[PDB]
Scaffold this active site. Structure first.
Site, short mmCIF file in Angstrom:
data_model
loop_
_atom_site.label_atom_id
_atom_site.label_comp_id
_atom_site.label_asym_id
_atom_site.label_seq_id
_atom_site.Cartn_x
_atom_site.Cartn_y
_atom_site.Cartn_z
N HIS A 196 -0.05 6.82 7.74
CA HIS A 196 -1.46 7.66 8.11
C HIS A 196 -2.03 7.09 9.32
O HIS A 196 -2.95 7.49 10.08
CB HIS A 196 -2.44 7.85 7.10
CG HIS A 196 -1.75 8.89 6.03
ND1 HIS A 196 -2.07 8.52 4.65
CD2 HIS A 196 -1.24 9.98 6.17
CE1 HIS A 196 -1.30 9.82 4.10
NE2 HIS A 196 -0.86 10.83 5.07
N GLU A 239 8.05 9.91 -1.58
CA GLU A 239 7.25 8.97 -0.82
C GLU A 239 6.66 8.34 -1.98
O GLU A 239 6.29 8.56 -3.14
CB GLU A 239 6.10 9.59 -0.05
CG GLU A 239 5.19 10.33 -0.79
CD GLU A 239 4.03 10.85 0.28
OE1 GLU A 239 4.37 11.70 0.99
OE2 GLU A 239 3.07 10.10 0.25
N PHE A 265 1.40 12.05 9.31
CA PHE A 265 2.00 10.68 9.08
C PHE A 265 2.70 10.52 10.58
O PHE A 265 3.02 11.71 11.20
CB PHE A 265 3.15 10.80 8.24
CG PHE A 265 2.87 10.37 6.69
CD1 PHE A 265 2.51 9.44 6.03
CD2 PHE A 265 2.47 11.69 6.01
CE1 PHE A 265 2.25 8.90 4.97
CE2 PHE A 265 2.28 11.63 4.64
CZ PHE A 265 2.28 10.10 3.85
N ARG A 305 3.72 4.30 3.49
CA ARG A 305 4.96 4.79 2.34
C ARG A 305 6.19 4.79 2.82
O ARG A 305 6.72 4.57 4.09
CB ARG A 305 4.79 6.33 2.41
CG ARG A 305 3.32 6.95 2.38
CD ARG A 305 2.47 6.43 0.79
NE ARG A 305 1.55 7.31 0.77
CZ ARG A 305 0.23 6.71 0.93
NH1 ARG A 305 0.10 5.56 1.10
NH2 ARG A 305 -0.94 7.49 0.90
N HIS A 331 6.16 11.01 -5.41
CA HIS A 331 5.91 12.48 -5.60
C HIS A 331 6.70 13.15 -4.30
O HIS A 331 7.04 12.35 -3.61
CB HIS A 331 4.55 12.94 -5.41
CG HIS A 331 3.75 12.86 -4.28
ND1 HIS A 331 4.23 13.48 -2.87
CD2 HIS A 331 2.50 12.34 -3.86
CE1 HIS A 331 3.27 13.36 -1.96
NE2 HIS A 331 2.35 12.54 -2.71
N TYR A 361 2.32 9.35 -7.73
CA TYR A 361 3.59 8.50 -6.99
C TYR A 361 4.62 8.15 -7.95
O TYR A 361 4.17 7.62 -8.94
CB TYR A 361 3.05 7.29 -5.98
CG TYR A 361 2.22 7.83 -4.94
CD1 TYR A 361 2.68 8.56 -3.81
CD2 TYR A 361 0.82 7.47 -4.98
CE1 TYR A 361 1.75 8.94 -2.70
CE2 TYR A 361 0.00 7.88 -3.89
CZ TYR A 361 0.37 8.59 -2.79
OH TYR A 361 -0.34 8.87 -1.88
N1 LIG Z 1 1.29 14.91 5.93
C1 LIG Z 1 2.16 15.23 4.90
N2 LIG Z 1 1.51 15.05 3.83
C2 LIG Z 1 2.33 15.38 2.69
C3 LIG Z 1 3.80 15.53 2.81
N3 LIG Z 1 4.29 15.83 1.63
C4 LIG Z 1 3.32 15.93 0.78
N4 LIG Z 1 2.27 15.54 1.24
C5 LIG Z 1 0.96 15.79 0.79
O1 LIG Z 1 0.40 16.93 1.42
C6 LIG Z 1 -1.15 16.74 1.46
C7 LIG Z 1 -1.69 16.79 2.65
O2 LIG Z 1 -0.90 15.93 3.46
C8 LIG Z 1 -1.38 15.52 0.38
O3 LIG Z 1 -1.47 15.79 -0.74
C9 LIG Z 1 -0.06 14.52 0.91
O4 LIG Z 1 -0.09 13.50 -0.07
P1 LIG Z 1 0.14 11.96 0.28
O5 LIG Z 1 -1.11 11.56 0.91
O6 LIG Z 1 0.03 11.41 -1.02
O7 LIG Z 1 1.41 11.69 0.77
C10 LIG Z 1 4.37 15.91 4.19
O8 LIG Z 1 5.59 15.92 4.68
N5 LIG Z 1 3.43 15.51 5.19
#
Ligand SMILES: Nc1nc2c(ncn2[C@@H]2O[C@H](CO)[C@@H](O)[C@H]2OP(=O)(O)O)c(=O)[nH]1
Length: 104
Positions: free
Chosen positions: A92, A58, A100, A77, A40, A38
């Site tokens: 989440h 985020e 999300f 986030r 990222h 993060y």
């Molecule tokens: N659900 C979701 N996950 C994302 C998105 N962009 C990156 N991620 C990442 O995609 C993977 C599956 O969700 C995880 O590595 C998640 O990381 P984070 O848990 O750190 O946010 C997004 O728009 N939506």
């Protein structure tokens, strides 16, 4: 009352600005923290209609009031853009899997 409610977690605007300032300076410095590295990129798979432009990043916001510094990110986030504009607060919590939902 809560400016943003992420499940059971309550955040004021100040909490959000604080997290965001932190997330953005690491982004500008090209520094990452945590096992998830993060801040990222946030791809917006969900398709959230944000009023600020892309790309998005985020950064976790913690219920403790502490700024994220590694360890468990929790489920909340802050999403900011390249201009350091707040796009939204998401979680989440209440979303299935790693999906999300917005914080109200
Ligand atoms: N659900 C979701 N996950 C994302 C998105 N962009 C990156 N991620 C990442 O995609 C993977 C599956 O969700 C995880 O590595 C998640 O990381 P984070 O848990 O750190 O946010 C997004 O728009 N939506």
């Amino acid at each position: 009352a809560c400016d943003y409610t992420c499940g059971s977690n309550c955040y004021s605007s100040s909490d959000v600005s604080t997290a965001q300032a932190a997330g953005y300076k690491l982004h500008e410095d090209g520094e990452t923290v945590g096992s998830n590295s993060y801040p990222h990129k946030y791809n917006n798979y969900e398709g959230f209609d944000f009023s600020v432009s892309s790309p998005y990043y985020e950064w976790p916001i913690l219920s403790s009031g502490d700024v994220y510094s590694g360890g468990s990110p929790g489920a909340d986030r802050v999403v900011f853009n390249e201009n350091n504009q707040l796009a939204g607060v998401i979680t989440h919590t209440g979303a299935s899997g790693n999906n999300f939902v917005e914080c109200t």
